[PDB]
């Protein structure tokens, strides 16, 4: 059973440099402002809600 199924078991090492996930805020840094433009339109749409 470990003749070939160890492949997924030994593939866990090549992904060690994956610790860089903290950069997830980097799009959130920007795209949230980019969707803030979308968020502004509903706040533009708040012009008429009163």
């Amino acid at each position: 059973v470990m003749a070939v199924k160890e492949e997924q078991y030994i593939q866990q090492y090549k992904k060690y440099e994956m610790l860089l996930n903290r950069v997830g805020y980097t799009p959130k840094i920007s795209h949230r402002e980019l969707v803030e433009m979308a968020e502004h339109r509903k706040e533009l749409d708040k012009m008429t809600k009163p």
Partner: protein
């Protein structure tokens, strides 16, 4: 005299908690969980390859 009492309670701890503990007391998780993924989920590893 010393062994018979030792064999029962202390060397018992030095036997029953020696071969699965003395070296492996932190390797029980390297004994059972090792068998959980690479022996129990061993057939489940083929699942990603099969599907």
């Amino acid at each position: 005299c010393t062994h018979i009492q030792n064999l029962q309670q202390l060397l018992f701890a030095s036997s029953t908690t020696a071969q699965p503990i003395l070296t492996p007391w932190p390797l029980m998780k390297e004994l059972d969980e090792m068998g959980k993924i690479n022996s129990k989920l061993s057939t489940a590893v083929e699942e990603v390859t099969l599907e």
